[PDB]
Amino acid sequence: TRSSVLADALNAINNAEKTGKRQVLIRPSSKVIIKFLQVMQKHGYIGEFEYIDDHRSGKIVVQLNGRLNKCGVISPRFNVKIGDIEKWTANLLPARQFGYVILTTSAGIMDHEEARRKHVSGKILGFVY
Amino acid sequence: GKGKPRGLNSARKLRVHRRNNRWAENNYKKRLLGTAFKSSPFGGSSHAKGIVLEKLGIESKQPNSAIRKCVRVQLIKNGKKVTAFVPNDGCLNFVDENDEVLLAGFGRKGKAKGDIPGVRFKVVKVSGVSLLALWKEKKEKPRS
Amino acid sequence: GRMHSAGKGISSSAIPYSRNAPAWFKLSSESVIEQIVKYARKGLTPSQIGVLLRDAHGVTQARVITGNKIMRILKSNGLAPEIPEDLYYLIKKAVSVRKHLERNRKDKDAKFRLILIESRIHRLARYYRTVAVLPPNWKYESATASALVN
Amino acid sequence: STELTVQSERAFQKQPHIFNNPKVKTSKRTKRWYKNAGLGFKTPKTAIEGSYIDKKCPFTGLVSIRGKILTGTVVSTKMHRTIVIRRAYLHYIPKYNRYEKRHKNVPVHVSPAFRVQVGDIVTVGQCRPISKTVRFNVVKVSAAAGKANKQFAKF
Amino acid sequence: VLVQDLLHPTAASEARKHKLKTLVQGPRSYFLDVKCPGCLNITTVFSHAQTAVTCESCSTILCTPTGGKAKLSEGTSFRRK
RNA sequence: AGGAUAGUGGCCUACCAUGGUUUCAACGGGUAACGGGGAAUAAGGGUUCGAUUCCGGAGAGGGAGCCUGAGAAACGGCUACC
RNA sequence: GGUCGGAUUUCCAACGGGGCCUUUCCUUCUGGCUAACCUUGAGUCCUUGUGGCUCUUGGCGAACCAGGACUUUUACUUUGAAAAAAUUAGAGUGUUCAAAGCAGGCGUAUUGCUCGAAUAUAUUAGCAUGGAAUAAUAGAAUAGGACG
RNA sequence: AGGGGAUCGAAGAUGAUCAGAUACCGUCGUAGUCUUAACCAUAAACUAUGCCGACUAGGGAUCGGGUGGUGUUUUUUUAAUGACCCACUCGGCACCUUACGAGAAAUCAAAGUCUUUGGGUUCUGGGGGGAGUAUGGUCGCAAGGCUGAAACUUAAAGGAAUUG
């Protein structure tokens, strides 16, 4: 049974990106998924995306611009201190100059650069580069 | 996936699984069972003293043909009987019977070395004198 | 799915998107409520009440035309059963299988199916006890089951 | 409560050095000492207006609350004036950066000013040793429903 | 492929796809106003009835259940919606 | 409730109740176990060691008992048994 | 810009914050230091861009003291107090160098002046403390519900 | 243990073959094979591929159900039906091509979405032997099953593929 709709979302996006598709369908599209998409859209890894309002759970159609290398969840969502963010970025990111580890902090879902600017920490959600 | 639990609250399962599968290592099993203390000719020691019981000629393993000139000795501290190889050209005339020898391993923590079958120890000294010194003629074997 | 099978069929009903349907129904929601009540007094379970309503009348979704569900309406009108419908039918199936088994000793397939049915009964009864639909220490005893189902 | 032989013991149960002078008869005719436990906890009206003695009561006894304040759920109400609470917690295992469920059973004295059942949540304050295993007194019952009065049969 | 309008697909394509597998799932059944020669009453029936609905006047039989859509009687007229 | 203690406490006694712990591993067995500060190694995560210079505990051949004393169940104190 | 790629700025770029309004909780009195003043009977001269406006009568005071018309419960994360010394990392210092140690350095030596002996880390749990995304938990269904 | 007991056939007999044949081959034949009531609980019990969920590729078939037809067909030589055809669709046993991907390779539509390593979860392994042995426990009437070491020994054992 489904245990992480975010995991299914990012797997579907990753497979479409690998196969060269310019658009992907995501279901059931929670608001954690929506916040994750907004972060990667802010950084430019995806384009416009559309929430389909069916009366059950919703859907997302994401437009892909071929700039995404890999996106995926970190399950389980480990708690991270301030000083373990550097370790997580070293482990998960290809380089120190680009790519983002997505955190869910009490201040909200943000990327690790924004978290370090805000001096906040939370749980680890996923990555994108 | 991966056939192992991943949840944040599965630490007990992971730790217990690691503990259970740890028993398949050799060194961990020896340490936890205390095999060196219990079942080992030495009491976990590097060296041990013994009294030579007899001189033996051990045939070499294939593809080598030789007589390896070992000694059967009985350890002082526990009375166990072991076979020790006497390493050098000659040096079996230095050993004699009823003499006191000091023994070490070959270097393979058990595990008989080379073409000598079932021999895990070597003679370092006899009658309190180093076998190397007796072979190099630096010293002489005491009468006692 | 198919918690006690390998089947993976979907075979579901797809209710319409429009929660305010169907722009051609003219009967009053109150008249629907009396129809539901009179069927319950006739002795029909909520699922087959909704079936016959949707069939012989234009009422597509009772929860849409009326503001509440069938079981909620019956409970509000004092017609709720002592045990829920799905649990009642699982118990009835178990009684049927047990009656078959008492005479068919060598039906090991029936014994296997009986075990699966009883385990489904116990899981549903546990859910109902936690949600307080059933009283605590309510138990499927397999001795008073025939009494429970009549 | 008021009934069922408050003096059920072989000795007369009373608050020490609290004299109910028989020569002078006031309106209330009896004198009950009590105190506030402090730390924001309030003395219940049951303790204020009760008949029980309970020398171990945090409000009407001789014990005082000082030290740790703990919270837990009730798992046993089988012995007299003592309950067992369960303090569930998660223990961090750094090597796996994960957690494991652990629990402790704390025996705690419950004053008759409180009514507790299995499932209630109570805050307990540390006191001087009361028995072999008990070191805490119930100081507040954070129970609103209890999940007992909504499981009855429906008519 | 490799570039598609997933948001605005073809009506023929959705008519082809499964009822649960469209962009927004919905029923493909419908309701019929049914007239029997016996009287002037109009009976609302379900396409996939799964019962033998009966008319108030012609109170024996109107339709017969089948695997999918109900098999309306030969002596009967009907109208969609 | 009492006794005892410097004092709380089944610490002990009288009476009463039947409780208390446990697969979230009780209870039992093993340890070539004194605990810790710490040590060796070590990309990160870890692995192994810590009788031993500092802290805490325990013991003075093995047990038990006790005197004097603020402080000892002391042993370069006593008493008994082995 | 008399200031030889060398030390800029309320016309601001992007940030990290707090406060207020938008249907927006701070449940509520106790007495007053007269709410970041929604009152100008008076009145304060710096001779024409724009933040240095005096005695302000009260006047609807949450930026404040324990009495209860006072509290759903956590996980998580931030910050802070402590967490012996030695050891570890590390600042200074010509032990002749070094391991070390915590010493030393400078006057005309006429009867003396002076730098030090830093700093960091030391986990889990406990204690305070800001946050309320993520995860759990509870509520009003035979109303035994809320508000006065 | 009762019934049954045609056939075939551990044991056995017997004729061949053979150096020997208490093997293969031939002819018989007890137990078994069948059944009832009880035991046993093991197989290369195999897809040697745990289960649940999501996504990724190009086709032709076929089973079950359902939907639709400028379709046909034995009835009315122009009726439901049933049977075929075409287009779909859901579920299933599977196949064909190729791997973009994976793999040591054989190969694999999963054995893919893995150093760009985290969807959930159970079980098992840690060089070859000793050894599934010894012992303890537990089950069985027994045969035996389940659980299950150590001493010691040893430099390979093993997988896939290449050439001969």
Ligand SMILES: [Mg+2]
């Ligand atoms: Mg199942």
Ligand SMILES: [Mg+2]
């Ligand atoms: Mg007492």
Ligand SMILES: [Mg+2]
């Ligand atoms: Mg007592």
Ligand SMILES: [Mg+2]
């Ligand atoms: Mg010891």
Ligand SMILES: [Mg+2]
């Ligand atoms: Mg130590």
Ligand SMILES: [Mg+2]
């Ligand atoms: Mg001592």
Ligand SMILES: [Mg+2]
């Ligand atoms: Mg003295």
Ligand SMILES: [Mg+2]
């Ligand atoms: Mg001495």
Ligand SMILES: [Mg+2]
């Ligand atoms: Mg001494």
Ligand SMILES: [Mg+2]
């Ligand atoms: Mg097979």
Ligand SMILES: [Mg+2]
């Ligand atoms: Mg197998």
Ligand SMILES: [Mg+2]
């Ligand atoms: Mg099939």
Ligand SMILES: [Mg+2]
């Ligand atoms: Mg092995």
